[PDB]
RNA sequence: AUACAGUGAAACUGCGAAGCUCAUUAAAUCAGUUAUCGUUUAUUUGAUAGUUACAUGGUAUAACUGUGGUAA
RNA sequence: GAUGAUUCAUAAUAACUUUUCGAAUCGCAUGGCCUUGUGCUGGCGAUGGUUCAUUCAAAUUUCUGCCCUAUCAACUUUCGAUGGUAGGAUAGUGGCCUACCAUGGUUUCAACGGGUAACGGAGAGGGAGCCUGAGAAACGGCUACCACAUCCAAGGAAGGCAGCAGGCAAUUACCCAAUCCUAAUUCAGGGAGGUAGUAUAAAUAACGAUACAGGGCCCAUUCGGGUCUUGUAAUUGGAAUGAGUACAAUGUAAAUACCUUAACGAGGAACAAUUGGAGGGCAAGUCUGGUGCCAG
């Protein structure tokens, strides 16, 4: 039944409308807003020792 | 009713549209009821997707049975609790009644590897192996959805870390596990990966996070359908380029015709592919063309007649395109040996004239003399002298796989391709048939394992010129900053597996596995003199093994699951069963590889000689935060060395290894008379002792092995060359040499030993073929006893031979290859073979009377 | 209730489990009767056995506890 | 001793037995004694046990018992047919079976065979074998086959539905109370069983008052003749009650139903039964034919 909701799913339009300590870090990992590769572009590595920290490769 | 996010559906839809895939990553205990919903979406999103659904699993389903009446009886019996209404059903357990899930173990995704599948779904996450990530996501259809469910507890906790800050690593109470902290970071590195909750919301941590709807609607299509429309009228082309799924493998096919039109039976022609492709297709429509074309004697090999189903139904299929009907035109044969399980052995047709295809096991290629075409599919796995041996005077089609399966190094495919520089035709598929090109899951997946890596030429050396060895340094590799994927290391860890890859032979998707999270293992790197990232020039991967892994496998055996295995103590234990060796702590070099094109230059035996003086201490917490970086690579005085008392290599015994490790002042110490199926080579294992320590039971085990080596080697060793034999019995001996010690010294022969093993009758005989009054049929009684006394060196110094001499010696004795035989080998007339043993003889003749 | 003692899941014992649809058969079905000194017989009823012991063993296990295989 | 009748009952002797049985069990009460030791001695039951009789049955078994029949005259020994002896099986007798022996047995007094309004005994997918029990060759179970057919990860597992009930479509819901049946039993159960579900007599009306009109009807091919309280397509008044709307009790395992029984319930009593037939008549209406104004 496209129209009719068939389980729990119902689709309009294009939306979609569905009938619904570890809880803490579900949260927060909801409110994170960097983007990972965002927060990977500050992200340097040494590449050895004493050497300068190397972020991008040319 | 809560809306979900517009990303979700809008990567859905996105992906169909494109033919894209995508992967959810659900996160919850409830993560599984929020799979029928996504189903859902997906078969709304366009119906001609594969409904089949794939389902991986560990050891136990979560919350229910693949069982119909199990569940039915459950559900009968709580209706009549009256715990559940008479006809309620949640929709999870719908989802699994009505679709067609198929229930696949972990330890047998063999089986997965052919069949099509809409959707897959990994239910462990901790469990995930580099193997069954390229397996699986292989056998999803173009706009399909993977799912991994990350519901254990452990790993919520390893998702927070990540996502509070990059640099610290969740690690709990000796497995540290940087695939699968490294497989997360990557997933957000992907476009097409998305990471759910089980309300679906999305957390931020995922690369899809400004995925937009596309507009409505691909030109490969269009250069398909053009094809075969104007092929349409030309049978038997129309009908087999029909089968083609894409651009390429048409083109493959039509090629293929070409040669099969050509007729010529110096001709071969290579395909190469990745998995998936489509090339057992391809090859199956062709040996449809060539029978229809009127080929008689078809021959196909393979190294087991079981991975040839897919080639054999593809064959039917362009049968059935050419008007084929079985039964009428052809006829099938199945095996009658269980171990091939009823595969298709032989194919015979009968209209116009009787044509026959059958599978021959790739080492019988002396009935090829009659073929007028052989197809080898999979010729990466055939060993090499094998294939050069199937290249007989007739039409011969290759396939070999490049990083499918365990395959092997694309070098070998290029050395392959330079020894048939025979006329070669070379074709490539890069087209996959199975979704859209350029698919981010795909580059994904082969940038997480490596998959796609390729070695570079790098021009700064050429400019530079090639570091001389004494220049270069090894430094030892982090391997926590490694497997980080700051974008430093990731090109520096590829270069490492395009290094890896290309030296030996095969080597395993789960490798990659292997080296990150087991702890003995450590990663050593000859890169060239410091003066942009540092190019690897020889890595060497050792494993310490021995009383040092006690305490781990201790761990192992608490948890109750042992992990991996001591190789060599284990092989030293049951051979000769000495308690001590066990005890001592040792490492063994698991590979060492070097640039082929800079082979021969001396890299990789400095590396061993310097790897040496490390952990004999002639040099003398980087661990990451546990829940800023640490170096990439440390110095070797940086790091103490632990207390070792030998050094092991294990490699497939072959001429050039052997006398690279016979150079570095390693001593052999067992060979396995049963040669390797893949490459048909008798695996060695070589050990070398550090200065400082003991060096008496290393000497012991050679001696023993050399009279091991001399009796057996006219049992399965009769195929290796005299000369190859020789090096192996002169190595042993350089470890008498080691040792300056007189304690353990070999003995003369007595008159008392002498009268024993030979009579005076024989004697006789041996005196008069010196004096030419024999045939030499007589003294082959003599032979084999000759060998052994002077391999054992019971003459001793008196009696002396040269090199040559010492293998026509050899091999009679021990090989026992006939002097025919021997001519061959060392390149010889027969006539001089017997006219130089003669005088071996007369020597040891003269040696006789003289002790007499 | 200092063996337990009320009730009591599970398990071991004891008893009992003995309408339909096809075909068709003349005193071989069946009905009446006689005999069983030629016979078996749960159960009901009544009779009926003077020919370590202040209590033997696991030569015993279920239910039960715990470890696993299997698509089942 | 018993019967009409016995080698029947019973008793004894000598042995035999894969020699049986002759309470190592449970509930309630704590009496009588004394030799104060918890010493001796004990009341009512349950569950067990040998044999006999009795009872519930069963298996063989005597004689009798309405069709037409010869256009059904021989049948039987046809892998026992008639009988004897010995054995095997059998709760047991017994050609029931087996070894030897004799050729017998029914029949024109109707054997044997045939037809029949002789509804006037079998199986549980099909044949074979086996297991329990006092009672079965079990609508139970097991094995081998012969086919059917289900599922599966194709390595195996399991079924008797090859059923039942329907059409050419609702068999369901409530109970062991009433009569009975089985059990460690008063108490628990029984789709045994019970309860419920889905051609016949009435009503649509009965009774008065007033007003206004002269016509109503019968018979007669014919012409006409015969006879008197009639018509309303008028107005009006007070009574009765049934279907329905339903408060109850009763009823019953409960419940439906039945019987009985408070209140309401009629003028268009619109609280509005049908069916068929025979005649009319009407237009600034329509069509057709003719000798105005006609005829169809």
Redesign the interface.
């Given at each position: 039944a496209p129209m009719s909701d068939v389980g729990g799913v119902l689709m309009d339009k294009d939306a979609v409308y569905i009938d619904i300590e570890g809880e803490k870090l579900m949260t927060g990992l909801q409110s994170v807003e960097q983007s990972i590769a965002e927060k990977f572009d500050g992200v340097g590595l040494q590449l050895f020792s004493n050497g300068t920290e190397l972020h991008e490769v040319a | 009713?809560?809306?979900?996010d517009?990303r979700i559906?809008s990567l859905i839809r996105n992906g169909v549209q494109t033919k894209q895939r995508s992967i959810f990553v659900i996160?919850?205990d409830r993560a599984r009821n929020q799979l029928?919903?996504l189903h859902?979406?997906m078969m709304?999103a366009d119906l001609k997707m594969n409904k089949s659904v794939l389902w991986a699993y560990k050891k136990k389903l979560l919350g229910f049975t693949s069982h119909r009446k199990k569940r039915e009886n459950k559900i009968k019996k709580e209706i009549k609790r009256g715990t559940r209404e008479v006809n309620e059903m949640d929709?999870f357990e719908?989802f699994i009644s009505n679709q067609n899930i198929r229930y696949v173990y972990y330890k047998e995704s063999e089986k997965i590897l052919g069949n099509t599948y809409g959707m897959c779904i990994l239910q462990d996450f901790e469990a995930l192996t580099p193997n069954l990530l390229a397996r699986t996501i292989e056998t999803v259809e173009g706009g399909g959805i993977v799912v991994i469910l990350l519901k254990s507890?452990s790993s919520?906790?390893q998702?927070?870390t990540?996502?509070?800050d990059?640099?610290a690593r969740y690690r709990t109470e000796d497995v540290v596990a940087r695939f699968n902290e490294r497989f997360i970071?990557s997933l957000?590195?992907n476009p097409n990966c998305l990471v759910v909750?089980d309300?679906?919301?999305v957390?931020?941590?995922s690369?899809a996070?400004n995925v937009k709807?596309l507009p409505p609607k691909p030109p490969k299509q269009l250069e398909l359908q053009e094809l075969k429309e104007s092929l349409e009228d030309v049978q038997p082309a129309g009908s087999l380029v029909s089968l083609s799924k894409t651009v390429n493998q048409a083109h493959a096919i039509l090629s293929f015709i070409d040669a099969i039109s050509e007729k010529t039976l110096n001709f071969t022609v290579a395909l190469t592919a990745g998995r998936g492709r489509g090339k057992s297709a391809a090859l199956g429509i062709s040996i449809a063309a060539a029978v229809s074309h009127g080929y008689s004697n078809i021959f196909v090999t393979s190294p087991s007649p079981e991975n040839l189903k897919t080639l054999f139904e593809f064959i039917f299929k362009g049968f059935d395109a050419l008007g084929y009907q079985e039964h009428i035109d052809y006829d099938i044969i199945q095996s009658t040996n269980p171990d091939f399980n009823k595969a298709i052995v032989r194919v015979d047709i009968k209209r116009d004239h009787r044509q026959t295809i059958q599978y021959i096991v790739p080492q019988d290629h002396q009935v090829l003399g009659q073929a007028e075409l052989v197809v080898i599919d999979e010729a990466a796995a055939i060993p090499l002298p094998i294939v050069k041996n199937l290249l007989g005077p007739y039409l011969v089609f290759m396939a070999s796989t490049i990083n499918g399966y365990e395959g092997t190094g694309r070098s070998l495919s290029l050395k392959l391709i330079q020894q048939l520089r025979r006329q070669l035709r070379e074709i490539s598929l890069d087209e996959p048939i199975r979704y859209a090109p350029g698919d981010p899951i795909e580059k994904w997946l082969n940038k997480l394992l490596c998959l796609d890596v390729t070695l570079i030429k790098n021009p700064r050396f050429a400019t530079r010129g090639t570091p001389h060895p004494s220049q270069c340094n090894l430094f030892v590799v982090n391997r926590d900053?490694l497997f980080?994927?700051?974008?430093?290391?990731e090109?520096?860890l590829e270069k490492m597996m395009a290094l890896y890859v290309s030296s030996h032979y095969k080597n395993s998707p789960n490798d990659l596995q292997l080296m990150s999270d087991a702890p003995a293992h450590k990663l050593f790197v000859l890169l060239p003199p410091i003066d942009?990232?540092?190019d690897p020039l020889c890595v060497i991967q050792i494993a310490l093994e021995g009383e040092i892994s006690k305490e781990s496998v201790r761990n192992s055996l608490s948890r109750g699951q042992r992990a991996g295995g001591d190789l060599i103590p284990w092989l030293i234990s049951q051979q000769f069963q000495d308690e001590e060796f066990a005890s001592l702590s040792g490492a063994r070099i698991v590979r060492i590889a070097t640039n082929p094109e800079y082979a021969s230059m001396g890299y990789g035996s400095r590396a061993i000689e310097l790897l040496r003086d490390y952990f004999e201490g002639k040099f003398t917490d980087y661990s990451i935060k546990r829940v800023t970086?640490?170096?990439?690579?440390?110095?070797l005085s940086?790091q103490p060395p632990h207390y070792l008392h030998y050094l092991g290599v294990s490699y497939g015994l072959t001429q050039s290894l052997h006398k690279f490790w016979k150079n570095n002042s390693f001593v052999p110490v067992y060979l396995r008379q049963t040669a390797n199926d893949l490459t048909g080579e008798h695996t060695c294992v070589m050990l070398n002792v550090l200065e400082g320590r003991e060096s008496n039971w290393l000497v012991e085990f050679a001696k023993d092995f050399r009279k091991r080596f001399l009796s057996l080697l006219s049992y399965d060793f009769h195929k290796f060359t005299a000369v190859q034999a020789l090096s192996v019995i002169e190595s042993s001996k350089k470890a008498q040499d080691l040792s300056d010690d007189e304690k353990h010294d070999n003995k003369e022969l007595t008159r008392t030993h002498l009268d024993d093993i030979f009579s005076p009758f024989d004697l006789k005989r041996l005196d008069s073929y010196s004096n030419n009054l024999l045939d030499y049929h007589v003294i082959g009684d003599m032979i084999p006893m000759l060998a052994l006394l002077y391999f054992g060196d019971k003459m001793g110094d008196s009696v002396k031979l040269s090199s040559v001499q010492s293998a026509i010696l050899l091999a009679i004795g021990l090989q026992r290859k006939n002097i025919d035989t021997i001519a061959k080998e060392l390149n010889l007339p027969s006539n001089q073979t017997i006219a130089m043993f003669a005088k071996i003889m007369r020597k040891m003749s003269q040696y006789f009377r003289q002790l007499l």
């Amino acid at each position: 039944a496209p129209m009719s909701d068939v389980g729990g799913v119902l689709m309009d339009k294009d939306a979609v409308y569905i009938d619904i300590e570890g809880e803490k870090l579900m949260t927060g990992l909801q409110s994170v807003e960097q983007s990972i590769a965002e927060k990977f572009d500050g992200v340097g590595l040494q590449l050895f020792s004493n050497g300068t920290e190397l972020h991008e490769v040319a | 009713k809560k809306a979900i996010d517009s990303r979700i559906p809008s990567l859905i839809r996105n992906g169909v549209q494109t033919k894209q895939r995508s992967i959810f990553v659900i996160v919850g205990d409830r993560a599984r009821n929020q799979l029928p919903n996504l189903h859902y979406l997906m078969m709304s999103a366009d119906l001609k997707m594969n409904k089949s659904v794939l389902w991986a699993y560990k050891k136990k389903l979560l919350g229910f049975t693949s069982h119909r009446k199990k569940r039915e009886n459950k559900i009968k019996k709580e209706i009549k609790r009256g715990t559940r209404e008479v006809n309620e059903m949640d929709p999870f357990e719908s989802f699994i009644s009505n679709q067609n899930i198929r229930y696949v173990y972990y330890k047998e995704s063999e089986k997965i590897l052919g069949n099509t599948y809409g959707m897959c779904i990994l239910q462990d996450f901790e469990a995930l192996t580099p193997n069954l990530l390229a397996r699986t996501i292989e056998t999803v259809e173009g706009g399909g959805i993977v799912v991994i469910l990350l519901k254990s507890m452990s790993s919520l906790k390893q998702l927070y870390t990540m996502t509070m800050d990059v640099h610290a690593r969740y690690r709990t109470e000796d497995v540290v596990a940087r695939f699968n902290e490294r497989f997360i970071l990557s997933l957000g590195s992907n476009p097409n990966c998305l990471v759910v909750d089980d309300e679906l919301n999305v957390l931020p941590l995922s690369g899809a996070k400004n995925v937009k709807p596309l507009p409505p609607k691909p030109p490969k299509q269009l250069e398909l359908q053009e094809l075969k429309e104007s092929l349409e009228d030309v049978q038997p082309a129309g009908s087999l380029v029909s089968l083609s799924k894409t651009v390429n493998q048409a083109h493959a096919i039509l090629s293929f015709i070409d040669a099969i039109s050509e007729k010529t039976l110096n001709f071969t022609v290579a395909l190469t592919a990745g998995r998936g492709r489509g090339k057992s297709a391809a090859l199956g429509i062709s040996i449809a063309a060539a029978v229809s074309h009127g080929y008689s004697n078809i021959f196909v090999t393979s190294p087991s007649p079981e991975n040839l189903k897919t080639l054999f139904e593809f064959i039917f299929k362009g049968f059935d395109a050419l008007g084929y009907q079985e039964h009428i035109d052809y006829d099938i044969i199945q095996s009658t040996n269980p171990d091939f399980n009823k595969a298709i052995v032989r194919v015979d047709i009968k209209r116009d004239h009787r044509q026959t295809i059958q599978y021959i096991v790739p080492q019988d290629h002396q009935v090829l003399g009659q073929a007028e075409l052989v197809v080898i599919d999979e010729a990466a796995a055939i060993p090499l002298p094998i294939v050069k041996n199937l290249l007989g005077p007739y039409l011969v089609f290759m396939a070999s796989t490049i990083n499918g399966y365990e395959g092997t190094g694309r070098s070998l495919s290029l050395k392959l391709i330079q020894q048939l520089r025979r006329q070669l035709r070379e074709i490539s598929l890069d087209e996959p048939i199975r979704y859209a090109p350029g698919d981010p899951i795909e580059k994904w997946l082969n940038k997480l394992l490596c998959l796609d890596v390729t070695l570079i030429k790098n021009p700064r050396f050429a400019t530079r010129g090639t570091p001389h060895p004494s220049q270069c340094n090894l430094f030892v590799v982090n391997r926590d900053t490694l497997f980080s994927y700051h974008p430093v290391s990731e090109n520096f860890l590829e270069k490492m597996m395009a290094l890896y890859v290309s030296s030996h032979y095969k080597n395993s998707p789960n490798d990659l596995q292997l080296m990150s999270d087991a702890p003995a293992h450590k990663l050593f790197v000859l890169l060239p003199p410091i003066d942009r990232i540092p190019d690897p020039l020889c890595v060497i991967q050792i494993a310490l093994e021995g009383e040092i892994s006690k305490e781990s496998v201790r761990n192992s055996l608490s948890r109750g699951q042992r992990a991996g295995g001591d190789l060599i103590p284990w092989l030293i234990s049951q051979q000769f069963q000495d308690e001590e060796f066990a005890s001592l702590s040792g490492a063994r070099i698991v590979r060492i590889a070097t640039n082929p094109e800079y082979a021969s230059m001396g890299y990789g035996s400095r590396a061993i000689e310097l790897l040496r003086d490390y952990f004999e201490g002639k040099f003398t917490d980087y661990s990451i935060k546990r829940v800023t970086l640490p170096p990439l690579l440390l110095k070797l005085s940086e790091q103490p060395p632990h207390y070792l008392h030998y050094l092991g290599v294990s490699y497939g015994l072959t001429q050039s290894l052997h006398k690279f490790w016979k150079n570095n002042s390693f001593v052999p110490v067992y060979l396995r008379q049963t040669a390797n199926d893949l490459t048909g080579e008798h695996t060695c294992v070589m050990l070398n002792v550090l200065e400082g320590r003991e060096s008496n039971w290393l000497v012991e085990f050679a001696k023993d092995f050399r009279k091991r080596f001399l009796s057996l080697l006219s049992y399965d060793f009769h195929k290796f060359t005299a000369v190859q034999a020789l090096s192996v019995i002169e190595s042993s001996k350089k470890a008498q040499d080691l040792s300056d010690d007189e304690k353990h010294d070999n003995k003369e022969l007595t008159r008392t030993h002498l009268d024993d093993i030979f009579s005076p009758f024989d004697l006789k005989r041996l005196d008069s073929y010196s004096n030419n009054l024999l045939d030499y049929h007589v003294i082959g009684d003599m032979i084999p006893m000759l060998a052994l006394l002077y391999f054992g060196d019971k003459m001793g110094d008196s009696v002396k031979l040269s090199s040559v001499q010492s293998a026509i010696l050899l091999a009679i004795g021990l090989q026992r290859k006939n002097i025919d035989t021997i001519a061959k080998e060392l390149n010889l007339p027969s006539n001089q073979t017997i006219a130089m043993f003669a005088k071996i003889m007369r020597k040891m003749s003269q040696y006789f009377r003289q002790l007499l």
